[PDB]
Structure formats: C-alpha cells, structure tokens
C-alpha cells in the first residue's frame, strides 16, 4: 500500500489529473490505491481504473509487438539481446496483468452485485487474461485462454439477462469477446457471428435512446462494423 496514507478522494482527484496529463502509470498507481481502500467503485471510478490500466498495458503490448516482430525476423532463413529485451517487456506486461486480475479477485468482483458493475469487472478479467494469452507460449497458454473465455462468458450471460442490447458495457464486452474469438481462440466464424448478432440487436434498440445514449452506443457499434469489414 504505497497509497495507504492518501485519502480515497485525493487518489480519485489525482487519477483525473494524471489522465489530463497523460501520466497513465501514475493514474494506475492512484486507482490501485483507491481500490485498496476496500470501498466499491462508482461508474466513473471503474472507468478511471479501466482507462489507467488500458493505457499502461497498451504501451507494453505495442512495445512487445515491435520487439517480437524484430525477434521473428532474426529467426528466418545475432546475440540474445532482442530475446532478452522482449522477455523483459513481456515480464513487465504480465506483472501489470497480474496486478489488475489481483484487484478484480481482491475484492472488486465478489462485492459487485449490480449488473453494470459485475459485467464491467468480468469484462476486465477477460481482457487482462486475453493480454496474457497474446504473449503466452508454454504449458499455461490453454488455461490462460480458458480463463479469458470463462470470464467473458459469465459477463455475456449477465449482460444478456440484465442490460439492453445498446448498453455500452454490453456492447464493449461483445466487441472484446469477438476479438478474443478471432485473435486468441482461432474461431473467426464465432468472432463474425457474435459481432453481427451484437450489431443487429443494438440497431433494433437504438429507437429507445436519447441523443446522448445513441452517440455512446453507435460509437461502439462502428467498431463492430470496422472489425466485420476487416474480417469479411
């Protein structure tokens, strides 16, 4: 608890300042601090946690892909440096994924009783196991993929019972599970069927929304469409 001595409200305030400053490592440390106070997170606070770690692992994943690509070219028809540096980046990425999954397990998920909070955290759990799956190569890979699938499936079952088809969390979950199917599970047809069904069911529910909800739903539906255009 590096943030153990700071007020919860001060950690949340500083997480917002870090977002404005694009200091995403600081933002993640502040939001880890806030979570470790042991209170549940509001909608906005869950978004701060998700934004902060998304951006930290986003930069690690982009770095890993650059290095892994240089490493693969070195192994076509040199020393250990490229492998060693890819491993260093990969190890730091796995640590950030382990930290997020740790917060979800201790104790965000078990205290999340509302559909919007529970689905949000289960989606995150799927996402961080998916990032681990992206770099996994040993004995653990099958179990990592199944941990992602299981978290996403539990989130999907709740979202389908409890949320309208245009709910941005439900739409964001479905988008991410479809990327899981395409990129990780080697199931491009499942990816394409989930993205299509998700898009079509949201389309048929747009008439119920305010101009502001409409704009949040259609932004994510456009990412389903961009993926389907790429995949078909």
């Amino acid at each position: 608890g590096a943030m153990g001595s700071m007020e919860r409200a001060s950690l949340i305030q500083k997480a917002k300042l870090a977002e404005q400053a694009e200091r995403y490592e600081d933002m993640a440390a502040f939001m880890k601090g806030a979570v470790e106070k042991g209170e549940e997170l509001s909608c906005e606070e869950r978004n701060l946690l998700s934004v902060a770690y998304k951006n930290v692992v986003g930069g690690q994943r982009a770095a890993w892909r650059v290095l892994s690509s240089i490493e693969q070219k070195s192994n076509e028809e040199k020393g250990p440096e490229v492998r060693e540096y890819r491993e260093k980046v990969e190890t730091e990425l796995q640590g950030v994924c382990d930290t997020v999954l740790g917060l979800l397990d201790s104790h965000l998920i078990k205290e999340a009783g509302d559909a919007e909070s529970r689905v949000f955290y289960l989606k995150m759990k799927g996402d961080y196991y998916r990032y681990l799956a992206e770099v996994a190569t040993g004995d653990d890979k099958k179990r990592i993929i199944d941990s992602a699938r299981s978290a996403y499936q539990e989130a999907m079952d709740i979202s389908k019972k409890e949320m309208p088809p245009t709910n941005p969390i439900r739409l964001g979950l479905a988008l991410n599970f479809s990327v899981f199917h395409y990129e990780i599970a080697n199931s491009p047809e499942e990816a394409i069927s989930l993205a299509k069904t998700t898009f079509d069911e949201a389309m048929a529910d747009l008439h119920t929304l305010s101009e502001d909800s409409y704009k949040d739903s259609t932004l994510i539906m456009q990412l389903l469409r961009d993926n389907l255009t790429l995949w078909t």
């Binding site: 998700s50 998304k54 989606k123 996402d127 941005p168 964001g172 994510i220 993926n227």
Partner: peptide, 11 residues
Amino acid sequence: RRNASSAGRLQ
C-alpha cells in the same frame, strides 16, 4: 487495419 477493441471508458 488492426482489430479494434473497446475504449477504456465506455460511457
């Protein structure tokens, strides 16, 4: 392009 996944913030 690359595969699009959801933004960190959804609403």
